[PDB]
């Protein structure tokens, strides 16, 4: 599959364990969609750990609970400190994205969504992979980098037990 | 004899789009989807109104019972695939019933996963 | 009319009176007119259930919501929405979201009749000549005329409630 | 699309955010209909604030039953709660018809900003583009002027 | 044709077409009818009094408590004038100008012109529009009278 949008000079066509030696073009399409989507989630997740360590949103998360954005702990402890109704509404919204706008059409490009723009900007364009081969590769590598990082940050929180300086030496 | 609930457009497209019938799904994908549904659902009847429904844990017991139910029905599916041997999921030139056995094994895996995910949601939230 | 003939004999006070006193349909294409009806029926079908849901809730029957809030919610349906626990509302949105997803992407209605969400068109006749049947056009009138009434009815309920109690 | 009434001179085809790389031909007219409608509202909105400032409030009674001399209603934000909901309903109704009139559906003559005013119909002296472009350009200025005016009336507190 | 009158010609120092005149004619006749209804409508709460009465919504046995030419309101009949406004719309959305094939013909529901006395075209069509023009100025002049020159009479 050398020449597919994901091959980079550092490794060429990586495939060390040989998970795609046979063609299985369906398998590659599914795994590429996972690679892009996991990268985008990881990229948004990686920024989701850095920013609260510097800035916190002004208002209150649940005004009828006293809870304000500041006092919510960062990392994998907000899950048990942010009210369950709050987290359920994020799940409902991500459900809307996965079922509505960000619904991967079969005929479309691997990561193409029929309602989002060139870097994801809401309100969109149909993909032009050949012209945008640079940024499509850039997204995958950044997603690839983010997936390593977010797996790190969560692991750092799991052991150190915080999100402060110790979690990131 | 065509009826609305089985031969209507919505009924036909709903039945065809089920995990057991959806076009283009590898057998392990059907098994995984069905197992996730079953494992997620089966936790509830035990962790609530169960023998240890009021214990401080009251959910790990439900998790164990749901995983046990998933394993029992998976064993039944393996019996079915080794006795009846359905061949509608086997790819061409394969051991008869191999597709069904793969579907059942991945149903067991998906049941474990769905049960664990439901338990994780209950404990965390 | 030409294109409005696809939704002909289905509106007006009497069944065969194309009302449109704004020209909203003229110059519009056949698919657009069919899509306009799909919006009309969907609004009306929800309006019919909305009015029924309003009345079974404004009379004192809000069990799921009295048993979830552990207290009898107020009869006023607008005020009962606030008292209803946020978990209940989010699940309500998600269930409709699943239904709206289900009808659109997996089990899409046809493009010639985009309101056949149950899909009777594959077992229906609609073009036979029997009297003790083939009154499907009449039952289309009753759905539309009732639904149109429910649309203005439910708005009246919401407007009056939000203003003159 | 790069040759419509919007390209005046000081800026060319000003689409920095790329709404035209994918803007369909009908989408331009739809968005143009949005722009023309937005601009005409803004011109009416702007006049509606600068004119009651210099010229005094309406000599009259506004509501013949609830003693509104037009002077207790301030010029700016907050007048929404001072003008009656029915005077608000009646302007809503009047604007409601002005679109439920001769249709502005896609492809209709109302969909390109044409409705039948014709206050300034010059006898085609190479001025149809002039009047059209002036209306679009002024509407663009009026929208920007209004939003600043709205922020002027809000952040300061009242009027200007 | 039609509303062209006798003391003046086309009186167009400003439409002047066919389709545009047709829409303008519909506006002209429509405004004419209301003024004639309003003009004779305003003289009636005068002599013969504020005739109304009977059980009305929040106005039971209301002797048309909406006084003065403007009518004011204060939950007196003028709030019931909104019902007039609503039912006026019903006739404006059922017997309207979109299916009104001629200028402002409503198919003559009353059939007053089926030899009952009015006639088709000629003076009657010209007399209706001319009378409407007079009433429209009269109603507007009556509006000025109530505002800053006392009441009607
Ligand atoms: C969600 C996990 C996930 C998934 C499904 C994929 C899927 C894929 N990767 Mg991939 N990758 C991932 C995470 C993932 N990646 C991460 C975290 C890294 C960083 C270490 C990489 C680094 C990487 C390289 C360097 C290459 C791939 C390639 C591929 C493709 C063929 C190899 C394969 O089947 O991998 C399973 C396939 C579309 C190859 C490719 O793009 O082939 C065209 C390739 O050369 N991946
Ligand atoms: C008597 C009850 C019972 C039965 C018949 C099975 C049956 C099975 N289990 Mg199982 N399981 C059970 C209870 C049971 N499980 C409980 C209570 C747990 C929680 C510790 C598990 C955890 C478990 C795991 C983690 C795995 C199985 C697996 C399996 C399959 C081999 C088989 C279908 C395996 C499987 O599904 O692989 C295909 C597997 O990996 N089981
Ligand atoms: C999405 C994956 C996921 C996540 C986030 C968790 C998260 C958690 N599990 Mg868990 N679990 C999972 C999958 C997962 N589990 C699966 C697939 C199984 C089946 C083998 C289990 C079986 C399991 C047991 C048996 C127990 C947990 C426990 C726990 C908690 C420590 C924590 C909330 C423990 C806990 O806190 O129980 C109360 C515990 O005893 N889990
Ligand atoms: C969601 C609203 C909706 C929609 C999309 C339609 C769509 C349609 N109707 Mg319909 N109708 C509705 C509500 C709706 N209806 C209601 C509530 C009534 C009861 C009065 C009717 C009564 C009715 C009749 C009697 C007839 C139709 C007909 C038609 C078809 C011709 C297209 C048309 O009239 O304009 C389509 C476009 C619209 C309706 C635009 C919606 C209205 C706009 C946005 C302005 C309204 C705003 C309103 C003034 C303020 C909201 C509050 C209000 C309740 C006070 C079309 C399929 C005709 C037909 O098919 O017969 C063959 C016909 O004869 N309708
Ligand atoms: C437009 C459709 C519509 C919408 C948006 C809602 C929305 C709502 N309903 Mg409701 N309802 C509807 C139709 C609708 N209803 C109908 C048709 C009925 C008659 C059966 C009811 C009977 C009803 C009851 C008895 C209660 C609600 C309640 C509620 C609220 C919480 C969600 C819930 O428990 O629903 C549950 C809805 C049902 C069990 C009805 C199922 C019937 C479906 C529509 C058949 C298809 C929510 C605001 C609860 C509340 O606290 O109200 C404030 C509550 O206790 N509804
Ligand atoms: C409702 C607003 C609106 C809309 C729909 C349009 C639409 C259009 N304009 Mg336009 N324009 C506007 C406002 C608007 N304009 C204003 C206010 C100005 C003055 C700066 C201009 C100046 C302008 C020029 C000079 C030209 C156009 C052109 C065009 C056309 C093609 C470009 C395009 O796709 O724009 C689409 C526009 C939008 C999608 C608007 C999005 C606005 C974003 C979301 C926000 C922008 C920042 C905003 C000011 C933030 C406000 C702060 C607030 C939150 C507090 C199209 C018909 C070109 C043309 O006619 O080509 C033939 C052209 O040459 N316009
Ligand atoms: C050309 C139009 C125009 C003009 C003449 C003014 C005029 C003024 N602005 Mg202003 N403003 C405008 C557009 C305009 N604004 C727009 C479009 C915005 C939004 C981007 C603002 C946002 C703004 C702020 C935030 C402030 C002003 C302020 C001021 C005053 C100093 C002055 C009266 C200041 C003021 O008086 O407070 C409101 C001030 O602090 N302006
Ligand atoms: C709703 C008002 C209205 C409308 C739409 C018409 C429409 C028409 N009239 Mg007509 N008319 C009216 C009122 C109206 N009339 C009144 C009240 C009088 C009595 C003076 C007349 C006397 C009259 C004569 C004598 C003749 C017409 C004719 C015509 C036709 C062509 C004239 C034309 O193009 O005028 C176009 C005019 C305009 C676009 C301007 C509209 C009026 C402006 C907005 C205001 C006028 C000044 C006003 C007094 C100030 C109001 C102040 C207020 C804001 C407080 C056309 C169908 C002619 C005809 O029959 O043609 C076949 C003809 O000979 N009319
Ligand atoms: C433009 C047409 C128009 C409008 C807007 C109104 C509106 C109104 N009329 Mg009126 N009226 C009209 C035509 C109109 N009428 C006509 C044609 C007649 C002659 C039969 C009358 C005779 C009439 C009387 C005798 C009185 C009103 C009154 C009123 C007010 C209270 C409602 C009522 O009793 O009506 C009655 C309406 C009718 C009997 C008309 C049929 C209300 C503001 C009453 C009021 O409060 O005085 C201002 C009142 O005393 N009107
Ligand atoms: C009542 C109702 C109904 C019904 C409903 C239903 C039927 C529901 C169901 C539901 C369900 C039934 C759901 C489920 C879900 C599930 C899930 C969501 C799961 C998930 C899972 C997961 C996620 C997993 C994962 C994993 C794996 C796979 C393995 C490994 C481990 C892990 C964990 C990772 C109707 C409509 C009739 C009507 C009325 C209403």
Coordinates of N, CA, C and O in Angstrom, one line a residue, chain C residues 55-128:
Chain C
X55 N -51.7 16.9 26.9 CA -53.0 16.7 27.6 C -52.8 15.6 28.7 O -53.4 15.8 29.8
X56 N -52.2 14.5 28.4 CA -51.9 13.5 29.4 C -50.9 14.0 30.5 O -50.8 13.3 31.5
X57 N -50.3 15.1 30.3 CA -49.4 15.7 31.2 C -49.9 16.9 32.0 O -49.6 17.1 33.1
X58 N -50.9 17.6 31.3 CA -51.5 18.7 32.0 C -52.7 18.3 32.8 O -53.3 19.2 33.5
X59 N -53.1 17.0 32.8 CA -54.1 16.5 33.6 C -53.7 15.9 34.9 O -54.5 15.8 35.9
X60 N -52.4 15.5 35.0 CA -51.9 15.0 36.3 C -51.2 13.6 36.2 O -50.9 13.0 37.2
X61 N -50.9 13.2 34.9 CA -50.3 11.9 34.7 C -48.9 12.1 34.1 O -48.7 12.2 32.9
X62 N -47.9 12.2 35.0 CA -46.5 12.3 34.7 C -45.7 11.3 35.5 O -44.7 11.6 36.2
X63 N -46.2 10.1 35.5 CA -45.6 9.0 36.3 C -44.1 9.0 36.3 O -43.4 9.2 37.3
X64 N -43.5 8.7 35.1 CA -42.1 8.8 34.9 C -41.6 10.2 34.9 O -41.7 10.9 33.8
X65 N -41.2 10.7 36.0 CA -41.1 12.1 36.3 C -41.7 12.5 37.6 O -41.3 13.5 38.2
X66 N -42.7 11.8 38.0 CA -43.1 11.8 39.4 C -42.4 10.7 40.2 O -42.1 10.9 41.4
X67 N -42.2 9.6 39.6 CA -41.4 8.5 40.2 C -39.9 8.7 40.1 O -39.1 8.1 40.9
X68 N -39.4 9.6 39.2 CA -38.0 9.9 39.1 C -37.6 11.1 39.9 O -36.5 11.2 40.4
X69 N -38.5 12.1 40.0 CA -38.3 13.2 40.8 C -38.7 13.0 42.3 O -38.4 13.9 43.1
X70 N -39.4 11.9 42.6 CA -39.9 11.6 43.9 C -40.8 12.7 44.5 O -40.8 12.9 45.7
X71 N -41.5 13.3 43.6 CA -42.5 14.4 44.0 C -43.4 14.6 42.8 O -43.0 14.6 41.6
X72 N -44.7 14.9 43.0 CA -45.6 15.2 41.9 C -45.2 16.5 41.2 O -45.3 17.6 41.7
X73 N -44.7 16.4 39.9 CA -44.4 17.5 39.1 C -45.6 18.4 38.9 O -46.7 18.0 38.9
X74 N -45.3 19.7 38.6 CA -46.4 20.6 38.3 C -47.2 20.2 37.0 O -46.6 19.7 36.1
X75 N -48.5 20.5 37.0 CA -49.3 20.1 35.9 C -48.9 20.8 34.6 O -49.0 20.3 33.5
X76 N -48.6 22.1 34.7 CA -48.2 22.9 33.6 C -47.0 22.2 32.9 O -45.9 22.1 33.4
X77 N -47.2 21.8 31.6 CA -46.2 21.0 30.9 C -44.9 21.8 30.7 O -43.8 21.2 30.7
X78 N -45.0 23.1 30.5 CA -43.8 23.9 30.4 C -42.9 23.9 31.7 O -41.7 23.7 31.7
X79 N -43.6 24.0 32.8 CA -42.9 24.1 34.1 C -42.5 22.7 34.5 O -41.5 22.5 35.2
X80 N -43.2 21.6 34.1 CA -42.8 20.3 34.4 C -41.6 19.9 33.7 O -40.8 19.0 34.1
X81 N -41.3 20.5 32.5 CA -40.1 20.2 31.8 C -38.9 20.6 32.6 O -37.8 19.9 32.6
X82 N -38.9 21.8 33.3 CA -37.8 22.2 34.1 C -37.6 21.2 35.3 O -36.5 20.8 35.6
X83 N -38.7 20.8 35.9 CA -38.6 19.9 37.1 C -38.1 18.5 36.7 O -37.4 17.9 37.5
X84 N -38.4 18.1 35.5 CA -37.9 16.8 35.0 C -36.4 16.7 35.1 O -35.7 17.6 34.6
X85 N -35.9 15.6 35.6 CA -34.5 15.5 35.9 C -33.7 15.5 34.6 O -34.1 15.0 33.6
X86 N -32.5 16.2 34.6 CA -31.7 16.4 33.4 C -31.4 15.1 32.7 O -31.2 15.0 31.5
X87 N -31.2 14.0 33.5 CA -31.0 12.7 32.9 C -32.1 12.3 32.0 O -31.9 11.7 31.0
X88 N -33.4 12.6 32.5 CA -34.5 12.2 31.7 C -34.6 12.9 30.3 O -34.9 12.3 29.3
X89 N -34.3 14.2 30.3 CA -34.3 15.0 29.1 C -33.3 14.5 28.1 O -33.6 14.4 26.9
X90 N -32.1 14.3 28.6 CA -31.0 13.9 27.7 C -31.3 12.6 27.1 O -31.0 12.3 25.9
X91 N -31.8 11.6 27.8 CA -32.2 10.3 27.3 C -33.4 10.5 26.3 O -33.4 9.8 25.3
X92 N -34.3 11.5 26.5 CA -35.3 11.7 25.6 C -34.8 12.2 24.3 O -35.3 11.8 23.2
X93 N -33.8 13.2 24.3 CA -33.2 13.6 23.1 C -32.5 12.5 22.4 O -32.6 12.4 21.1
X94 N -31.8 11.7 23.1 CA -31.0 10.6 22.5 C -31.9 9.6 21.8 O -31.6 9.1 20.7
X95 N -33.1 9.3 22.4 CA -34.0 8.3 21.8 C -34.5 8.8 20.5 O -34.6 8.1 19.5
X96 N -34.9 10.1 20.4 CA -35.4 10.7 19.2 C -34.2 10.8 18.2 O -34.4 10.6 17.0
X97 N -33.0 11.1 18.7 CA -31.9 11.1 17.8 C -31.6 9.8 17.1 O -31.3 9.7 15.9
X98 N -31.8 8.7 17.9 CA -31.6 7.4 17.3 C -32.7 7.1 16.3 O -32.5 6.6 15.2
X99 N -34.0 7.5 16.6 CA -35.1 7.3 15.7 C -34.8 8.1 14.4 O -35.1 7.6 13.3
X100 N -34.4 9.4 14.5 CA -34.1 10.2 13.4 C -33.0 9.7 12.6 O -33.0 9.7 11.3
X101 N -31.9 9.2 13.2 CA -30.9 8.5 12.5 C -31.4 7.3 11.8 O -31.1 7.1 10.6
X102 N -32.2 6.4 12.5 CA -32.6 5.2 12.0 C -33.4 5.4 10.7 O -33.2 4.7 9.7
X103 N -34.4 6.3 10.7 CA -35.2 6.6 9.5 C -34.4 7.1 8.4 O -34.6 6.7 7.2
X104 N -33.4 8.0 8.6 CA -32.7 8.7 7.6 C -31.7 7.8 6.9 O -31.8 7.5 5.7
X105 N -30.6 7.4 7.6 CA -29.5 6.7 7.0 C -29.7 5.2 6.8 O -29.6 4.8 5.6
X106 N -30.1 4.4 7.8 CA -30.2 3.0 7.6 C -31.4 2.6 6.8 O -31.3 1.7 5.9
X107 N -32.6 3.1 7.1 CA -33.9 2.7 6.5 C -34.5 3.9 5.9 O -35.6 4.4 6.3
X108 N -33.9 4.5 4.8 CA -34.4 5.7 4.2 C -35.7 5.5 3.6 O -36.0 4.5 3.0
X109 N -36.6 6.5 3.7 CA -37.8 6.5 2.9 C -37.5 6.7 1.5 O -36.5 7.2 1.1
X110 N -38.4 6.3 0.6 CA -38.2 6.5 -0.9 C -38.0 8.0 -1.2 O -38.3 8.9 -0.4
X111 N -37.6 8.3 -2.4 CA -37.4 9.6 -2.9 C -38.7 10.2 -3.6 O -38.8 11.4 -3.7
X112 N -39.5 9.3 -4.0 CA -40.8 9.7 -4.6 C -41.9 10.0 -3.5 O -42.7 10.8 -3.8
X113 N -41.8 9.3 -2.4 CA -42.7 9.5 -1.3 C -41.9 9.6 0.0 O -41.7 8.6 0.7
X114 N -41.2 10.8 0.2 CA -40.3 10.9 1.3 C -40.9 10.9 2.7 O -40.2 11.2 3.7
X115 N -42.2 10.7 2.8 CA -42.9 10.6 4.1 C -43.3 9.2 4.5 O -43.9 9.0 5.5
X116 N -42.9 8.2 3.7 CA -43.2 6.8 4.0 C -42.2 6.1 4.9 O -41.5 5.2 4.6
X117 N -42.1 6.7 6.1 CA -41.1 6.3 7.1 C -41.3 4.9 7.5 O -40.4 4.2 8.0
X118 N -42.6 4.4 7.4 CA -42.9 3.0 7.7 C -42.7 2.2 6.5 O -42.4 1.0 6.5
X119 N -42.9 2.8 5.3 CA -42.7 2.2 4.0 C -43.8 1.3 3.6 O -43.6 0.1 3.2
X120 N -45.0 1.8 3.6 CA -46.2 1.0 3.1 C -46.1 0.9 1.6 O -46.8 0.0 1.0
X121 N -45.4 1.7 0.9 CA -45.4 1.8 -0.6 C -45.0 0.5 -1.2 O -45.4 0.2 -2.4
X122 N -44.3 -0.4 -0.5 CA -43.9 -1.7 -1.1 C -45.0 -2.8 -0.9 O -44.9 -3.8 -1.5
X123 N -45.9 -2.6 0.0 CA -47.1 -3.5 0.1 C -48.4 -2.8 -0.2 O -49.4 -3.5 -0.4
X124 N -48.5 -1.5 -0.3 CA -49.7 -0.8 -0.6 C -50.0 -0.8 -2.1 O -49.2 -1.1 -2.9
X125 N -51.3 -0.6 -2.4 CA -51.8 -0.5 -3.8 C -52.0 1.0 -4.2 O -51.4 1.4 -5.1
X126 N -52.9 1.7 -3.5 CA -53.1 3.1 -3.6 C -53.7 3.5 -5.0 O -54.0 4.7 -5.2
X127 N -53.8 2.5 -5.9 CA -54.3 2.8 -7.2 C -55.3 1.8 -7.7 O -55.6 1.8 -8.9
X128 N -55.9 1.0 -6.8 CA -56.9 0.1 -7.2 C -58.3 0.9 -7.2 O -58.3 2.1 -7.0

